[PDB]
């Protein structure tokens, strides 16, 4: 959700999103997460899986 | 998947289940009789004459 004039302001400048991370920073952030789930469901699959 | 959450997870499932495994319920109450004492029958005042 945005408002109008805020889209507009956005819109006439001609904005861009913008960043200065690499590539490999957000595979690792993402590998993390998979990693948490994978870890949550071994557990429960080894302790909770009845 | 980390191998040491599922290890902690285990460990703590089965602490939980030890402590649980050992409470005793004992009862040791006393009765609801009344221990009794000595009385004697005391003498109404009385009046004889012939």
Avoid: C, W
């Amino acid at each position: 959700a945005v408002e109008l004039e805020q889209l507009a302001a956005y819109g006439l400048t001609g904005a861009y999103p913008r960043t200065n991370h690499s590539v490999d920073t957000i595979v690792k952030t993402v590998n993390n997460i998979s990693a948490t789930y994978s870890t949550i469901a071994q557990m429960l699959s080894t302790i909770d899986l009845d | 998947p980390n191998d040491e959450a599922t290890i902690k997870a285990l460990d703590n499932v089965i602490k939980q289940i030890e402590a649980l495994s050992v409470i005793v319920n004992r009862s040791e109450k006393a009765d609801d009789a009344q221990i009794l004492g000595p009385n004697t029958y005391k003498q109404l005042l009385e009046h004889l004459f012939s």
